[PDB]
Amino acid sequence: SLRSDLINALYDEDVCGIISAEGKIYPLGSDKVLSTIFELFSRPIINKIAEKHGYIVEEPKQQNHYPDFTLYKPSEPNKKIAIDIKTTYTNKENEKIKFTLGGYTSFIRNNTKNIVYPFDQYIAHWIIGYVYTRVKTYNINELNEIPKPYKGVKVFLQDKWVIAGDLAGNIGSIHAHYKDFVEGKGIFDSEDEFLDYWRNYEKYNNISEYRNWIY
Amino acid sequence: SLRSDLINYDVCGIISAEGKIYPLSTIFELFSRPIINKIAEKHGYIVEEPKQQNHYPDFTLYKPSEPNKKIAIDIKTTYTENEKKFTLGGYTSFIRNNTKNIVYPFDQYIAHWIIGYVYTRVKTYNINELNEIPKPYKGVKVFLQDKWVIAGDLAGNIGSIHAHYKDFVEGKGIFDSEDEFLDYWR
Prior knowledge:
Cofactor (chain A): Mg(2+)
CATH superfamily of chain A: DNA mismatch repair MutH/Restriction endonuclease, type II
Distance between the termini of chain A: 39 Å
GO molecular function (chain A): DNA binding; metal ion binding; type II site-specific deoxyribonuclease activity
Shape of chain A: globular
Organism (chain A): Escherichia coli
Oligomer: homodimer
Strand order of the largest sheet of chain A: 3-4-5-6-7
Radius of gyration of chain A: 19 Å
Strand content of chain A: 25-35%
Keywords (chain A): DNA-binding, Endonuclease, Hydrolase, Magnesium, Metal-binding, Nuclease, Plasmid, Restriction system
CATH class of chain A: Alpha Beta
EC number (chain A): 3.1.21.4
Number of strands of chain A: 9
Order of helices and strands of chain A: HEEHEEEHEEEEHHH
CATH topology of chain A: ECO RV Endonuclease, Chain A
Largest interface: A-B, 26 and 25 residues
């Protein structure tokens, strides 16, 4: 399916510079650079698989809008798919990581603000997350010498709600191991609870407190 | 002089280890940081960046001896080929109240400069397809001017003058003084 096809496609496919018209190459570092770098690398793959399955892939005009990519069949435009790309680092392999997942006051509460199509028109909300391990000019022959800002990069594709948390970072994600984002191990029980919790966030400061309140 | 050496951009894709180029306002800061340091260290200035985002300025510069003679720098970016502005800071924080959202008390700063970028909004590739990749921007011009000399009288945050890039590099805004500008932008 578009999804299985997409995660395996992502799992397959190490950027190390910015190349100029005159051939010169400039190294990156961590200084919103790596995030934009991982979003760029993502465009092609997304285009490739959507197309293979007949999906239109839209990006937003007024940039600050959710979502990074909206995918839908023309036969079914009420079933749009939303893909947001998130990036995080980690200073130690196998140590808990977390992401930010955007606004909880815009579209989630207004259905139309800061989102491309109205919120109701999207059936699923996927997050593609990059977890990179934290680590003058050059010619095309120096590629292996140009110092990279990381020593590895992992990626998962998952549902926004399944990995959302109960605290602002903008919503934060759960504070867990890469493994738990892949495996889908979160705190919310359903998407409804995830959205009830975030549409009503001002009574409650965390999940436990949220549930006593709903009782 | 800092401003001197300081005062004295055709990227076309991101490159991979294996050669693949991926066609494309952060590259502009990217180009910025290394140069700020070089000229700053050439003069013994400590360059510092914000620990929290949404904080002023992008770069603070001061020699460790004196910290009441700092310099604040902000990289701005904007786009149009030969047409009619920037968004500078906010008029209610650190400016109206000396310590809100600025890395250091506003009064530690004897200068606020703006390095600005201006261009015209004009599949993977390989090294040989280099000069065939489609640039998304043309005509990058850049200027280094004082924040107050540039500032306008209208908010979007304080607005700059909406003029042509030369008015920027020469300093032809509308307030007659730094003191006039600050009074006005409360």
